């Protein structure tokens, strides 16, 4: 019974990072080696596990988180990082057990006139906790004056558009990111290699 | 504070083209409406073109449709006005203008100092 990684990695549409998608993977066989040895990925960085051992391991669950960010923001999808994406959109824990997988998606996610569909959160009163998702759109008070829910001077809608242009340099181009979290509870482990 | 840095413009003969640029600082493009106004001799300041940087939707006035093209590079915080098929009557001070909402139909809040465009007749 094959893990549905196709549905994750080959989804036509990816989530905005602020509204990052999570798929729970369970009760299935996963060939991680075929992903790890793929030339398709520009980032494949594992924490707390060796990628060469993944086909020999069983986990209680795998969570597949996915979203789009800029090439120059992929460095923020790692334990201990800071910046608008790590702080306000998607935060990995210090004790992360999993792999961060990314690839350039300029051919899918940019278009003539710009693709404005992908958003990020630019403003928040505090940093996200690890694996916290915030999809709120409260007006952010950026000045000394209360906003009273009105977008205006120093009163910001907290989400902004990347506006991906196909002519953007590689740092500004869209990257698709899949984060695999490996859960190791003292319980039956139902997601295994071949 | 927010600043709008304008560049481009100057002199061109009728039928020629100019590109104006506007760089926003103190604000990040991707939510607000940003665009151009102009003030020709003996005329009130008027809308030229606007782009919603949240969703890329552009707007023009009857005298600018087709000839002028507005575009945004959100990553570079820059908007551009490509002005083709210029006429002497396009002679004006062109102002970059930034709203505090997503809507191009709303009034601008922040203004550039303005850039002279002079189109000479044949
Ligand atoms: C995604 O599709 C490509 C091309 O059809 C294929 O090589 C690959 O097996 C698929 N990836 C996954 C993770 O299923």
Numbering used by the authors:
A (entry chain AAA): 334 to 527
B (entry chain BBB): 1 to 122
What does the publication say?
We report four nanobodies (C5, H3, C1, F2) engineered as homotrimers with pmolar affinity for the receptor binding domain (RBD) of the SARS-CoV-2 spike protein.
Binding of C5 trimer to RBD-Kent was shown to be only two-fold weaker than to RBD-Victoria, whilst binding of C5 monomer was ~25-fold weaker.
